[PDB]
């Protein structure tokens, strides 16, 4: 059950870390690039690794999500548990309120267009066959 998928509150998507470095949402169940290793690397901070791509979820200085080729400081996300049961993930490196988020088309949002009150930033990590 150690592997997880990250389900968005909106759109019926779960997060995918694709082998070309892109990040998006998919609504398909048999999506190997959506299988994630979510590990706390500091108190309140996680790394999210796409196990099949080998890439870490990352956010660059422009607020854009990508799948990193190795683990860097751009791969750290502050994880907050909301009272509604979902979690938010915000850039630990760029402390500007920049969240992991998917729009209505399943495409990642630019960090400066996100806020913790947006349902697009709300995700549920769920163990796979847990
Ligand atoms: Cl956007
Ligand atoms: Na899947």
Q: How far is the CA of 85 from the centre of ligand 2 (A)?
A: 21
Q: State the SS3 of the chain.
A: CCCEEEEECCCCCEEEECCCCCEEEECCCCCHHHCEEEEEEECCEEEEEECCCCEEEEECCCCCEEEECCCCHHHCEEEEECCCCCEEEEECCCCCCCECCECCCCCECCHHHCCCCCHHHCEEEEECCC
Nearest ligand to the CA of 64 is 1
Contact 102, 110 (CB under 8 A): no
- The method recorded for this entry reads X-ray
Rounded to 5 degrees, what are φ and ψ at 32?
-60, -30
Domain of 88 in residue numbering reads as: 1-130
**CATH code at 65?**
2.80.10.50
Nearest ligand to the CA of 5 is 2
Q: Report the b/e string of 29-68 with b at 16+ CB within 10 A.
A: eebebbbbebeeeeeeebbbbbbbbebbbbbeeebebbbb
What CA–CA distance (Å, rounded) separates 6 from 118? 16
Query: How many domains are contained in the chain?
Result: 1
Q: How far is the CA of 109 from the centre of ligand 1 (A)?
A: 4
Q: How far is the CA of 102 from the centre of ligand 1 (A)?
A: 8
Contact 107, 11 (CB under 8 A): no
Nearest ligand to the CA of 25 is 2
Q: Which two tokens stand for residue 112?
A: 């400066």
What CA–CA distance (Å, rounded) separates 130 from 112? 35
Sign of the four-CA dihedral 67, 109, 104, 48 = positive
């Amino acid at each position: 059950m150690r592997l997880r998928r990250l389900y968005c509150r909106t759109g019926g998507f779960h997060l995918q870390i694709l082998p070309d470095g892109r990040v998006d949402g998919t609504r398909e169940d048999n999506s190997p690039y959506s299988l994630l290793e979510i590990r706390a690397v500091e108190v309140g901070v996680v790394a999210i690794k796409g196990v099949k791509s080998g890439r870490y979820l990352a956010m660059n200085k422009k607020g854009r999500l990508y799948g990193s080729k190795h683990f860097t400081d751009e791969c750290k996300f502050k994880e907050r548990l909301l009272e509604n049961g979902y979690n938010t993930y915000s850039s630990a490196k760029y402390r500007r309120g920049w969240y992991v988020a998917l729009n209505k088309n399943g495409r990642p949002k630019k960090g400066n267009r996100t806020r913790r009150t947006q349902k697009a930033t709300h995700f549920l990590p769920l163990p796979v066959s847990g």
